[PDB]
Amino acid sequence: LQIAVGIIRNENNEIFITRRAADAHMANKLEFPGGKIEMGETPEQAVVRELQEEVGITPQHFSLFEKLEYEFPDRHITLWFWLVERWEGEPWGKEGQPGEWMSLVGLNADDFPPANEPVIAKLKRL
């Protein structure tokens, strides 16, 4: 299971975070909008499509900030963390999910999935 997520951050060094549903894997956890990279699709396409679907924006000139693999108690997933600094549209809860800007400095890794630990840390430096 390959996963593409977008680390969306504005000029104010804030990132746009969303909270996962109470009945989803890693429920109630904070997260970077993202989803499964589908067949016949590239990870770059997957992140654009996913952000469009989840927060209504289209990533532009983004880079791969981090790529890693994590083993959850019942599944193994590869995460593709894209740093998105330019985009069209305004990020919002397009799928009716909680969404808001969060200072990079005040992020608490414990709030996100354990898989994001290194990314969250590395983030506090760029």
Query: Would you list which residues are annotated within the binding site?
Result: 20, 25, 31-34, 54, 116
User: How deeply is 117 buried, as exposed, middle or buried, from its count of CB atoms within 10 A (0-12, 13-18, 19+)?
Assistant: middle
The edge-to-edge listing of strands for the beta sheet with 99-103 is 30-31, 14-19, 99-103
- The radius of gyration of the chain from alpha carbons, rounded to an integer in Å, stands at 13
Which 9-48 positions form the footprint of Mn ion (CB under 5 A)? Answer: 35
Minimum CB distance to ligand 8OG, residue 4 (Å) = 8
Helix (H, G, I), strand (E, B) or coil at 73: coil
Which 2-41 positions form the footprint of ligand 8OG (CB under 6 A)? Answer: 3, 5, 24-26, 31-36
The closest alpha carbon to 29, from 38, 21, 41, belongs to 21
| Binding footprint of ligand 8OG, residue count (CB under 6 A) | 17
Instruction: Tell me which of Mn ion, ligand 8OG, none is bound by residue 32, counting a contact when its beta carbon lies within the kind-specific cut-off of 5 to 8 angstroms.
Output: ligand 8OG
Which 71-110 positions form the footprint of ligand 8OG (CB under 6 A)? Answer: 77, 79
Q: Which is nearer to ligand 8OG, 91 or 113 (CB)?
A: 113
Strands 75-84 and 2-8: parallel
**What does the binding site for Mn ion look like in residue numbers (CB under 5 A)?**
35
**What does the binding site for ligand 8OG look like in residue numbers (CB under 6 A)?**
3, 5, 24-26, 31-36, 77, 79, 112-113, 115-116
